[PDB]
Amino acid sequence: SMNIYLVLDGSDSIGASNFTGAKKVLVNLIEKVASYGVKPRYGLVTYATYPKIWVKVSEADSSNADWVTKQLNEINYEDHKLKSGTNTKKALQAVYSMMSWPGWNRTRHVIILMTDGLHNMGGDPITVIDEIRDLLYIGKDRNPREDYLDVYVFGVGPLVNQVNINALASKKDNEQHVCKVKDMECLEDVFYQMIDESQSLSLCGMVWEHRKGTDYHKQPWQAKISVIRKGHESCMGAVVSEYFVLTAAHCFTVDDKEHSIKVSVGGEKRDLEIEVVLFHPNYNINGKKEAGIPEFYDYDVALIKLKNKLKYGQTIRPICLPCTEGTTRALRLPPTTTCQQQKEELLPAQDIKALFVSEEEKKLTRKEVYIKNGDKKGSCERDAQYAPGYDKVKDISEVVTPRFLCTGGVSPYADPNTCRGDSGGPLIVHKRSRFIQVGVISWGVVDVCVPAHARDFHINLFQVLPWLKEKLQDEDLGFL
Ligand SMILES: [Co+2]
Ligand code: NA
Ligand code: NA
Ligand code: NA
Ligand code: NA
Ligand code: NA
Ligand code: NA
């Protein structure tokens, strides 16, 4: 159990702009905490001469991040009256009341005070902190219980009184509880002190976003696949479970032997041995030659089972898959959510904002693209006619099957294109600060590694669920 008390100074010395800027920090914090699957109870208070309680931890809805964010969004600077006075002591007493009781010992409390430190009314606020520690039994028995209280003070504005701010904040070794609101480095560090990374290692679609992170931290699911032959093959894939990596089927052939295939993940120097490659049963690159389709990429997906089981860390984590309980939670939806509901959320009938990862000279970079899933879909699919060897295709819909998603082009925006080395990699949608894989990079019209018909096709994972569900049934992913 965790309670977070957001206390915002709305006095005259703060000003409208900085007050709004301060709320932004709070909105972003609530969102990041939620993205970790953590559900604390929130308290929300604004103050000047007197405090105004907007949300109390005792309220049932106080643990509903969307509802709290809504409340915070509705708060207007002018709502808090009597701005000529600043009584920080009273603001903290409002928090004390929320902790008061007219398994308390298991609740951890976090106070986040945003002020310039210029209280001009009431006594010394430090006194209330002392009452709070006594109330929560902290610093009483050396069972110190210091872990149960954290007082963060974010200095707002250019004219801040550092002494008063330092006085109220917690003082814990190897930790920082004071930050200037504009100091983005400091604020960032605060988050990682507050939330326990360990409780979220089993979460799919998670990324450690800290400024010190590497390419492996920013794309933890990314797997590099090597096939040594004839020329050597280079493909990308995504970790979907402790034993499996999802990639494209065309990256391999029935002639490739297990030992000739190596996988690399997490920025580790070593390569990983595979047990076997599971091609989608319906994949047959030569199945439509008669129809004028030299290479048929329908059902172009394959699952690589690794010899050794992976352990999830900050550089090796699974991406979320469509229609699984993991994705439902990542999207913060109720347990009664359906595959169709997930589909409507992730792949609506319109231009969908998405991304894929590309290796550009030892470095991984995200490329933003748009999935044409609206009435712009046909135009994208038809451009498949300009693809090499597809000039004599009778019905283009026979090559561009219902299994494909389409990206690339100049509308609505100039989309970047996938390169040969990106083949097999995941096509991703970013939602609720989480990453969900909706497709597998399959093939393109033009090798641009540009023309308006330079489209890229990906296998829609929603269209191969029966197979995914079957091959991953024992991976504890909880398919719906
Ligand atoms: Co003031
Ligand atoms: Na709401
Ligand atoms: Na003690
Ligand atoms: Na950890
Ligand atoms: Na480390
Ligand atoms: Na669920
Ligand atoms: Na679909």
UniProtKB/Swiss-Prot annotation:
Domain of life of the source: Eukaryota
Name of the protein described by the UniProt record: Complement factor B Bb
Annotated ranges, domain VWFA: 3-195
Sites where the protein binds Mg(2+): S11, S13, T86
Entry-listed glycosylation sites: N18, K24, N105
Cofactor(s) this protein requires: Mg(2+); Mn(2+)
Oligomeric form and interacting partners: Catalytic component of the C3 convertase of the alternative complement pathway, also named C3bBb, composed of complement factor B Bb and complement C3b. Catalytic component of the C5 convertase of the alternative complement pathway, also named C3bBb3b, composed of complement factor B Bb and additional molecules of complement C3b. Interacts to CFP; this interaction contributes to the stabilization of the active C3-convertase enzyme complex.
Places the protein is found: Cell surface
Effect of F19L: In AHUS4; gain-of-function mutation that results in enhanced formation of the C3bBb
The protein's role, per its UniProt record: Serine protease component of the complement C3 and C5 convertase complexes of the alternative complement pathway. Following cleavage and activation by factor D (CFD), forms the C3 convertase together with complement C3b. As part of the C3 convertase, cleaves and activates C3 into C3a anaphylatoxin and C3b opsonin, the next components of the complement pathways. When an additional complement C3b molecule binds to the C3 convertase, forms the C5 convertase, which cleaves and activates C5 into C5a anaphylatoxin and C5b component of the membrane attack complex.
Binding site for Mn(2+): S11, S13, T86
Annotated catalytic residues: H250 (charge relay system), D300 (charge relay system), S423 (charge relay system)
Outcome reported for the amino acid change (mutating E368L): Decreased cleavage and activation by CFD
Catalytic activity: Cleavage of Arg-|-Ser bond in complement component C3 alpha-chain to yield C3a and C3b, and Arg-|-Xaa bond in complement component C5 alpha-chain to yield C5a and C5b
Entire-sequence positions represented here: 268 to 764 of 764
Ranges of residues in domain Peptidase S1: 203-473
Cysteine pairs bridged by disulfides in the record: C204-C320, C235-C251, C323-C339, C380-C406, C419-C449
